Design a binder for this molecule. Structure first.
Ligand SMILES: Nc1ccn([C@@H]2O[C@H](COP(=O)(O)O)[C@@H](O)[C@H]2O)c(=O)n1
Length: 475
């Protein structure tokens, strides 16, 4: 009959998220290993982490307090952006909370942040074609990019599927992690396009029956919002680190912990659902490990006590302290829902996931038990979450520093000479990460093979050998 129906039931997970680890929902997982977790990110824009946390937290409390049913608005979007640059020096001179009129905003996209299906959808966005957006190969310059070609100029819609395949091939040819292709955003009707996207989300979310259907609508609109670059800066933080998390928590889902949230431009809506599910899974893993008092080692990062104390002294968010102390009900329904949501994650590439998340030698032996050669040496293809693309389970075992997985992969006679889309082998990675035991274990194998010299001399896309990297360990 009469009940308390929380606006964002998923706040249970934001309260459950360990305080000392909260920075993980803003600091891309890709940085952790080499930038001492949150340190690199913070130094780049001092106070941006506290402003990002406070933005999400205050705006969530505002929606939770409301008597009205949650709906997206141009006003909520402006409020998020305003808060995301509150004390940030690098955002104060870029009008926080105000939309662009004619200003130019541009960036480059590497093949590693793109997909064929994603480029197809990107070229299909009518607002981009009519709003005068520019995209194509070129050169970065002092006053924006110099386009050699602009695909939006005289664009044939029938050509878009073949153009996408060609664009990806060109981006690939240049280099997986290198930038050749640039995007110059729309310089008119940004206010009008922002309103159309909002009206479209509110319309479509009403006719999405299942969580999976709802997730596709959410990501399709977050993507359109990111692609239409409405603000001078902070669009990633505004749309993906903040905005995205509200409809997620509205559905009783945990917020997202991304490895790489910079895929909201040239990835497809369907591909992004998988990306977001991986990010929700990361949040659940962080929560579960901290609950088990298990030290978190995800994405190659072992936090020191010095790093941990530095973050708590730094942390300043009255809204987060409020969420932390909220009254929290049987979470069984919420757990079943998120487990049902993440059950799909399993099926696709289990060995690559095992190299990232697994650490029990017994669980690893069992996972690798009965896997054929083609499975143990499988390189994931374009369209999957960025971390997998062109990589073998061995590549990810080395990068993650997963000794138990690497040991089992060696026992399974995995091809350690395979190159990823960056021309790097497991040995190039062992050098870069400076792990002597991993490199020693790889070399013992390489030297037992006949093509040892050829293997050791493998050059990556920078024409560097694994040993060029080893010799450079420590800048
Ligand atoms: N201080 C910051 C702020 C943003 N970033 C990068 O920018 C992304 C978000 O882009 P915005 O600047 O559009 O918010 C982050 O996911 C991260 O890759 C960073 O590396 N350090």
């Amino acid at each position: 009959g009469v009940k308390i129906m929380p606006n964002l039931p998923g706040l249970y997970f934001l309260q459950a998220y360990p305080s000392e680890e909260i920075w993980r929902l803003f600091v891309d997982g890709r940085f952790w290993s080499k930038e001492n977790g949150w340190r690199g990110y913070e130094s780049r824009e001092p106070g941006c982490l506290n402003a990002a946390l406070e933005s999400l937290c205050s705006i969530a409390l505002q929606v939770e307090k409301s008597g009205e049913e949650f709906e997206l608005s141009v006003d909520l979007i402006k409020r998020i952006h305003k808060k995301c640059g509150k004390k940030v020096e690098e955002l104060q001179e870029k009008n926080p909370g105000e939309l662009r009129t004619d200003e130019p905003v541009s960036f480059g996209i590497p093949a590693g942040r793109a997909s064929i299906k994603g480029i197809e959808e990107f070229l299909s966005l009518v607002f981009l074609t009519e709003g005068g957006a520019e995209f194509g190969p070129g050169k970065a310059g002092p006053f924006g990019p110099r386009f050699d070609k602009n695909y939006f100029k005289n664009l044939n819609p029938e050509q878009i599927p073949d153009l996408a395949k060609q664009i990806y091939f060109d981006m690939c040819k240049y280099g997986h992690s290198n930038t050749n292709h640039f995007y110059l955003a729309v310089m008119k009707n940004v206010d009008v396009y922002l309103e159309k996207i909002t009206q479209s989300y509110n319309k479509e979310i009403k006719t999405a029956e299942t969580l999976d259907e709802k997730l596709k609508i959410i990501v399709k609109h977050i993507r359109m919002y990111e692609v239409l670059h409405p603000f001078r800066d902070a669009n990633g933080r505004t749309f993906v680190n903040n905005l995205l998390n509200i409809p997620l928590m509205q559905q009783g889902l945990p917020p997202a912990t991304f490895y790489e949230p910079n895929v909201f431009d040239l990835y497809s809506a369907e591909e992004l659902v998988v990306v977001v599910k991986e990010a929700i899974f990361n949040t659940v893993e962080i929560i579960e490990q901290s609950k088990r008092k298990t030290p978190i080692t995800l994405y190659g990062y072992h936090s020191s006590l010095e790093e941990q104390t530095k973050f708590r002294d730094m942390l300043d968010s009255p809204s987060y302290e409020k969420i932390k102390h909220m009254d929290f009900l049987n979470p069984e329904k919420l757990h079943l829902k998120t487990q049902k949501c993440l059950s799909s994650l399993n099926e696709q590439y289990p060995l690559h996931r095992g190299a990232i998340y697994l650490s029990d030698p017994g669980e690893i032996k069992l996972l690798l038990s009965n896997r054929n050669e083609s499975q143990i040496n499988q390189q994931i293809e374009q369209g999957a979450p960025p971390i997998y693309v062109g990589k073998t389970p061995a590549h990810l075992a080395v990068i993650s520093g997963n000794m138990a997985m690497l040991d089992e992969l060696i026992a399974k006679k995995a091809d350690l000479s395979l190159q990823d889309y960056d021309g790097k082998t497991a040995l190039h990675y062992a050098a870069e990460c400076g792990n002597m035991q991993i490199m020693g274990k790889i070399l013992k194998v390489v030297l037992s093979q006949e093509d040892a010299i050829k293997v050791l001399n493998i050059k990556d896309n920078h024409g560097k050998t694994a040993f060029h990297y080893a010799a450079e360990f420590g800048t």
